[PDB]
């Protein structure tokens, strides 16, 4: 539909906020405790593990949980929880009208992935697979589990698909290619669908079913990955919010079902405008930098040009190597009592809606190609009626990954 | 504290000089943290105080500068009057000839050359065996760095330059005299010291001294030099930019100061295609701790990650050649941190005593209070030069 799809997506996010409100009722988190992004990632992690049918030593397999952070005596304190995977399954179905609602689970998953894309470096994995560190710019979706289906695969960058393909060929060079090969060609046709020139499509045809793929196909997958540095694929960008934001909205009395919801329009921008989200800050960490990290993760903007990202946001989105923060998630061995909460700035000034024969053609179309965001509107402008003229500083570095110093995933 | 203030005033000088030539070349923050730009500025000031041995208009020096333009790196060649850079160097040291700061940058270039370049073809052309690569520290120093340069020169370096002058055959003999007593002072048994006395005390040096100087160079493979930790100018530069005062905080090349400064360093390097940025990181890491001749199991324990031999690295060196496409390359942070920090009768005696022969702390520790017990794996190779494939200097 146009709206029938908007009812389904609204029923899904509605589901996620209902699930969050009730698990905050049953973990006894105050309002402030419910608005901490750390608490919300733990509940997201628990409900994802509860429904991990494929993955279900001294650890109970019917139990899940994680770190929860609570206000006691004027400080934050790490309190660990354990919950039956069956009881979280029942609470999730209770909050979705008895439905499995796998689409809400993949939604939370896409949010985790985009958060990881904005936060963690993957250079070490890129080198050990034969790819260049420059291809960091194409590593969207690289952290997605293999249980995210088509939704997961739509947001995977050309680099992600090339990396998983190199690794599968790497493990076939070891004569163990019997019956696991339609899996190989489905991910080849998924990367095929991601290319946007008949030349790269044709080369991805040649890569598909060579009966015995090895280092010759690996070098083809590297040629087509550098090919996507100039002639870019078309990958989906799903704006997925942490559970605590749908949570607060459903608490507020916002009806996602009858109002509808789209990940592509202004809905995510509008909800983030009225967000109250908190984050634990490590000592010597800039809370605005942590805010840009979360902001860029909620709009899957880690691969977009920073000048386009700064225009939309109203404040400058600096490269990752110039941030004074590390991840959102707090490790088990960090002193939580040394840390304090800071409101995350997540608002935006504007919103938006944005040696072979096939090797000679691509080289030509790379030499040929000449190297901004024109779907940018004011948040008063509910319809896409009056686009806004972009204002960048062209001197500013385009890439989020220029001079990256981020910790490896 | 006086030597610690002196060394601190010298390093402080180097960071001031780097900040000033970055303000005057208009290099951005990121551009200033590129080790390639930093080697070019070091080379210019070294060449400006030379015209013989410090290492086309003769009154100008310069080199390649790498700038961010339109999302890529671009090689810009620069030229500067040798007097104008000399004046900036003196401005940054309170009008003093900071000769020690110039030697410092030199020892850094030398240790970098030791970690990067193979010398086996020079060794064979001089009559020495390639195994003696372990003793070629300081081999790329210019031929007048004085006592500071000569103190870090390995037994093999001194043997090679001594064989090399004898190969061509008072005016050029006091040079021979000092170099023999400098290599004599580097030995640590009366037998080879006495043997170096006889080679030094020789009317007509020839094939007999060359073979003697080879016997005592193999002697130094069993019966075994200064190690100066020198950082590139961009690291002192960033630290003095931070407001770190090296003079009243003091600085030693031997302690934890280099470890501590490297720990919070932000240094970038251009990576050639198909080069491992971690391998380039190990290359620079080993150059800043002059550890190209130290045992890799000692180097790996100290660093917390394995320091592999040079022949198994996937890099070719930091300096970028005239012919290489800079726009094809990208910058990567160099991992420079460390897990820990640290501190024929004579022929008969030597041969007998050769067949005979059978300080690591955490950075929390500040002072050497609680040593850590070293934990190696003997199967890991000990020499940086095992199966070396590096390009000849």
Among B58, B137, B136, B146, residue whose Cα is nearest residue B103 = B146
CB A42 within 8 A of CB A68: yes
Q: Alpha-carbon distance A95 to A203, whole Å?
A: 47
Q: How far is B223 from chain A (nearest CA, A)?
A: 41
Among A399, A386, A326, residue whose Cα is nearest residue A350 = A386
Among B302, B310, B309, residue whose Cα is nearest residue B376 = B302
Q: Which of A124, A133, A371 sits opposite B271 (nearest CB)?
A: A133
Task: Please count the residues of chain B.
Answer: 393
**Test mutation, A121, A123, A124, A127, chain B, max B CBs within 10 A:** A127
With CA atoms as reference, the chain A residue closest to B266 would be: A405
CB A302 within 8 A of CB A292: no
How far apart, in Å, are the Cα atoms of A189 and each of A139, A204, A230? 18, 8, 21
Q: Alpha-carbon distance B89 to B289, whole Å?
A: 25
With CA atoms as reference, the chain B residue closest to A406 would be: B333
CB contact under 8 Å between A127 and B332, yes or no, is no
The SS3 of residue A107 is helix
Which residue(s) pair with A68 in the sheet?
A79
| Residues whose CB falls within 8 Å of the CB of residue A23, separated by 6 or more in sequence, listed in order | A43, A46, A47, A88, A91
Name the structure determination technique: X-ray
Q: Alpha-carbon distance B276 to A124, whole Å?
A: 9
CB A339 within 8 A of CB A274: no
Among A289, A73, A322, A43, residue whose Cα is nearest residue B30 = A322
Q: Alpha-carbon distance B138 to A6, whole Å?
A: 71
CB A157 within 8 A of CB A139: yes
Q: Kindly give the residue spans of alpha helices, DSSP state H, lying in chain B.
A: 2-25, 29-32, 35-48, 82-91, 99-116, 120-125, 146-151, 155-167, 174-186, 190-200, 207-222, 233-242, 246-249, 257-263, 277-288, 296-303, 345-356
CB B160 within 8 A of CB B128: yes
- Angle, helix A215-230 to helix A357-368, in steps of 10 degrees: 20
CB B342 within 8 A of CB B295: no
Q: From chain B, pick out residues whose CB is under 8 angstroms from the CB of A132.
A: 273-274, 330
**Test mutation, A321, A324, A363, A408, chain B, max B CBs within 10 A:** A321
Q: What DSSP letter does each residue of B127-161 carry, written as one string?
A: T--GGGGGG-TTTTS-S--HHHHHHT--HHHHHHH
Size of interface A-B (CB pairs under 8 A): 34
Which contiguous run of DSSP H or E holds residue A165? helix A158-170
Burial class of B142 by CB neighbour count within 10 A (0 to 12, 13 to 18, 19+): middle
Q: Alpha-carbon distance B47 to B61, whole Å?
A: 7
The SS3 of residue A65 is strand
Q: Which of A127, A371, A403 sits opposite B268 (nearest CB)?
A: A403
Q: Alpha-carbon distance A401 to A306, whole Å?
A: 10
At residue A157's C-alpha, the angle toward residues A155 and A161, to 5°, is 105
Structure tokens at B365: 């520790």
Among A228, A395, A239, residue whose Cα is nearest residue A310 = A395
Q: From chain B, pick out residues whose CB is under 8 angstroms from the CB of A321.
A: 333
| Residues whose CB falls within 8 Å of the CB of residue B99, separated by 6 or more in sequence, listed in order | none
CB B231 within 8 A of CB B39: no
Which contiguous run of DSSP H or E holds residue B331? strand B330-333
- Angle, helix B155-167 to helix B174-186, in steps of 10 degrees: 150
Structure tokens at A300: 């899957």
DSSP A42: H
Q: Alpha-carbon distance A85 to A171, whole Å?
A: 34
Among A135, A172, A231, residue whose Cα is nearest residue B332 = A135
Which residue(s) pair with A75 in the sheet?
A72
CB B380 within 8 A of CB B312: no
CB contact under 8 Å between A127 and B278, yes or no, is yes
Among B228, B219, B255, residue whose Cα is nearest residue B151 = B228
Among A258, A254, A268, A292, residue whose Cα is nearest residue A353 = A268
Among B185, B111, B168, residue whose Cα is nearest residue B145 = B111
Q: Which of B70, B274, B333 sits opposite A403 (nearest CB)?
A: B333
Q: Alpha-carbon distance A39 to A6, whole Å?
A: 28
Task: Please count the residues of chain A.
Answer: 409
| Residue A283 C-alpha from the chain's centroid | 26
What are the backbone angles phi and psi of residue A76, rounded to the nearest 5°? -95, 140
CB B40 within 8 A of CB B130: no
Q: Alpha-carbon distance A229 to A233, whole Å?
A: 9
| Residues whose CB falls within 8 Å of the CB of residue A210, separated by 6 or more in sequence, listed in order | A216, A217
Among A194, A182, A188, A255, residue whose Cα is nearest residue A227 = A194
How far apart, in Å, are the Cα atoms of A400 and each of A15, A121, A134, B166? 33, 11, 12, 59
DSSP A321: G
CB contact under 8 Å between B333 and A124, yes or no, is no
Domain ranges of chain B: 1-393
Question: Contacts by A81-86 with C-beta closer than 8 Å and gap 24+?
Answer: A81/A27, A81/A42, A83/A46, A85/A49, A85/A50, A85/A56, A86/A50, A86/A62
| Residues whose CB falls within 8 Å of the CB of residue A240, separated by 6 or more in sequence, listed in order | A107, A108, A110, A111, A114, A263, A298, A300
| Residue A116 C-alpha from the chain's centroid | 7
Which residue(s) pair with B270 in the sheet?
B331
Resolution of this model in Å is 3.0
Distance separating the N- and C-terminal Cα atoms of chain B: 39
Q: How far is B41 from chain A (nearest CA, A)?
A: 21
With CA atoms as reference, the chain A residue closest to B29 would be: A322
Q: Alpha-carbon distance B393 to B390, whole Å?
A: 9
**What's the number of CA atoms in the CB half-sphere (13 Å) around residue A327?**
17
Structure tokens at B279: 């391998």
Q: Which of A397, A404, A405 sits opposite B68 (nearest CB)?
A: A397
CB B213 within 8 A of CB B158: no
CB B136 within 8 A of CB B153: no
CB contact under 8 Å between A127 and B273, yes or no, is no
Give the sign of the dihedral formed by CA B380, CA B386, CA B387, CA B389. positive
Burial class of A386 by CB neighbour count within 10 A (0 to 12, 13 to 18, 19+): exposed
Q: From chain A, pick out residues whose CB is under 8 angstroms from the CB of B332.
A: 123, 133, 404
Q: Alpha-carbon distance B303 to B306, whole Å?
A: 7
| Residues whose CB falls within 8 Å of the CB of residue B110, separated by 6 or more in sequence, listed in order | B138, B140, B141, B149, B152
- A186's torsion region: left (phi>0), alpha (psi -120 to 50) or beta? alpha
């Amino acid at each position: 539909n146009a709206t029938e799809i908007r009812a389904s997506v609204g029923r899904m996010v509605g589901g996620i906020g209902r699930f969050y409100i009730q698990m905050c009722t049953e973990l006894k988190l105050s309002d402030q405790e419910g608005r901490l992004i750390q608490n919300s990632i733990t509940i997201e992690r628990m409900v994802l593990s509860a429904f991990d049918e494929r993955r279900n030593a001294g650890k109970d397999p019917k139990k899940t949980g994680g770190p929860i952070y609570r206000r006691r005596d004027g400080k934050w304190v790490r309190e660990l929880i354990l919950y039956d995977k069956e009881e979280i399954r029942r609470i999730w179905r209770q909050a979705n009208n008895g439905e499995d609602a796998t689409a809400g689970l993949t939604h939370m998953m896409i949010w985790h992935s985009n958060l990881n894309d904005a936060t963690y470096q993957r250079t070490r994995a890129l080198v050990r697979t034969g790819m260049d560190p420059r291809m960091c710019s194409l590593m969207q979706g690289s952290t997605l589990p293999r249980r995210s289906g088509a939704a997961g695969a739509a947001i995977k960058g050309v680099g992600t698909m090339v990396m998983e393909l190199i690794r599968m060929i790497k493990r076939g060079i070891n004569r163990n290619f019997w019956r696991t090969r339609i899996a190989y060609e489905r991910m080849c046709n998924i990367l095929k669908g991601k290319f946007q020139t008949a030349a790269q499509k044709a080369m991805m045809d040649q890569v598909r079913e060579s009966r015995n793929p090895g280092n010759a196909e690996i070098e083809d997958l590297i040629f087509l990955a550098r090919s996507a540095l100039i002639l870019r694929g078309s990958i989906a960008h799903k704006s997925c919010l942490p559970a605590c934001v749908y949570g607060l909205a459903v608490a507020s009395g916002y009806d996602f079902e009858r109002e509808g919801y789209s990940l592509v329009g202004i809905d995510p921008f509008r909800l983030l405008q009225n967000s109250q989200v908190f984050s634990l800050i490590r000592p010597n960490e800039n809370p605005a930098h942590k805010s840009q990290l979360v902001w860029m993760a909620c709009h899957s903007a880690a691969f977009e040009d920073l000048r386009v990202s700064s225009f939309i946001r109203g404040t400058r989105v600096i490269p990752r190597g110039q941030l004074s923060t590390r991840g959102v998630q707090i490790a088990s061995n960090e002193n939580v009592e040394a840390m304090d909460s800071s409101t995350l700035e997540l608002r935006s000034r504007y919103w938006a809606i944005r040696t072979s024969d096939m090797r000679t053609e691509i080289i030509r179309m790379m030499e040929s190609a000449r190297p901004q965001g024109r779907g940018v509107f004011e948040l008063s402008d509910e319809k896409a009626t009056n686009p806004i003229v972009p204002s960048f500083d062209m001197s500013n570095e385009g890439s989020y990954f220029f001079g990256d110093n981020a910790e490896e995933y």
